[PDB]
Amino acid sequence: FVIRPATAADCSDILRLIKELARYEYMEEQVILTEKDLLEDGFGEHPFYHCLVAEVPKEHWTPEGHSIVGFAMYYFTYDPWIGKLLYLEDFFVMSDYRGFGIGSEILKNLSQVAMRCRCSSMHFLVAEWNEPSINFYKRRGASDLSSEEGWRLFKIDKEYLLKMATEE
Amino acid sequence: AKFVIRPATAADCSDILRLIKELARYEYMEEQVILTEKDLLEDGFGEHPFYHCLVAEVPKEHWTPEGHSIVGFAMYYFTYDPWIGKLLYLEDFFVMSDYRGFGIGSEILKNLSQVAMRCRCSSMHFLVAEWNEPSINFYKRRGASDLSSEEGWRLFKIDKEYLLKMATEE
C-alpha cells in the first residue's frame, strides 16, 4: 500500500470514505460535502484543506475495484503560544484494511508534512468511546488535552451568529 | 474609553505578541509563549495567512501606562468540517483590565459574526475550560452549546518530539 497526496480524480473515493467515516461516527446524515465542493475546496486554487489517500495493489482492491482504501484530511491552524499547528480533520481506514499498518503510514506522512511546514504540534478530536483510536494515538505519544487541561469544544451556530451580527 | 475595532496589520505584530502575553500572563502562562514577533509577522502577513486578527485601538489620551494603543484582540482562522460546513474558529479573545465593560468585547464578537456571514460559515467554534463557569455562561447566553460534552468529542494532541520521531522513523 502507498500513501500519497490526493488528486482531483481521487474526489469520488474521498467522498465515499468521508461518508464511511461519518457513518462510523453516527454523523452520516449530516454530511454536507459534495464532489463539487471537494474539488473546489481541496484543489489547487487557494486550497482550504489537504487530503492524503492510501491505495493498495490489485490483489487487495475492494469488491468494487476501489484501490483507495484510506485517507486523512487536514489543515493548518494557529496557537498563540507555539504558532502554526497541523490539524487533522478526518482520518479513516476501511474495516477490512485496518491493522495492516496503513494508518501508521498516514500518520508518518502527516508528521513529515508537519516538520516541513514547521508545525509544532498536531491536534485532532476523538470520540469518547473510540477506544481503538484513543490507544492508537496514545501509543504514538498523543495526550488527551480535554482530560489534562479541561478544554471543551464549544460552537455557536449560524442563527446566533446572525443575531449578534445584526444586533449592533 | 473611546475605541475602534480594526484588522491587525503587519505593523501591529509587537502589540499582538504583547497581548498574547498579557492573556498568558492573565493565566500565569507567560513563560510558555515561545512565539516571537518574527513568527507573527511571517505567519500572519505573508501569502497564506495562518491566522487573522482584529484589534481594539484607543486614542492617545487613553494609551496604556507604557504608551500602547491596543487593549484587546481576537485571533482567528477558518477551518472546515465535512459534516458541519466551513467554520470560523476563534482561537484567542481578550481585552486588558482597565478597558473591559465598555463594549469592546461585544463589538469584536459582532464584527467576527459579520466576517462569519461574509465567509459563509455555518458556525463559530472555540475552546473553554470545563471549570470556567463565568465564561461558559457568557457564551451560553449567546447561544453556544458544549459540543464536547453533548456529542462526546475529546481534543487530543501529539507534540513535536513525537511528530519528529514518526517523520524520521526507520
Ligand SMILES: CC(C)(COP(=O)(O)OP(=O)(O)OC[C@H]1O[C@@H](n2cnc3c(N)ncnc32)[C@H](O)[C@@H]1OP(=O)(O)O)[C@@H](O)C(=O)NCCC(=O)NCCS
Ligand atoms: C485509526 C485508524 C484510521 C488507523 O489505521 P490502521 O490502518 O488500522 O492503523 P494500523 O494498521 O497502523 O495499526 C493497527 C494496529 O495493529 C498493529 N499493527 C499494524 N501493522 C502491523 C504489522 N505490520 N505487524 C504487527 N502489528 C501491526 C499496530 O501496532 C496497531 O496496534 P495498536 O493499536 O495496539 O498499537 C483506523 O483503524 C480506522 O480507520 N478506524 C476507525 C475510524 C477512526 O476511529 N478514525 C479515526 C480518528 S478520531
Ligand SMILES: CC(C)(COP(=O)(O)OP(=O)(O)OC[C@H]1O[C@@H](n2cnc3c(N)ncnc32)[C@H](O)[C@@H]1OP(=O)(O)O)[C@H](O)C(=O)NCCC(=O)NCCS
Ligand atoms: C469576555 C471579554 C473579551 C469581554 O469583553 P468586554 O470588552 O469587557 O465586554 P463588553 O463591555 O463588550 O461587555 C460584555 C459583557 O461581558 C461581561 N463583562 C463586561 N465587563 C466585564 C468585566 N469587567 N469582567 C467580567 N465580565 C465583564 C458583561 O457581563 C456582559 O456579558 P453578558 O452579556 O453575558 O451579561 C473579557 O473581559 C475578557 O477580555 N475575557 C476573559 C475572561 C472572563 O473574565 N470571562 C467571562 C464571562 S462574563
Ligand SMILES: CCCNCCCNCCCNCC
Ligand atoms: C450539531 C451537530 C454536530 N455538530 C458537530 C460535531 C463536532 N466535531 C466533529 C468532528 C471531527 N474530527 C474527527 C477526528
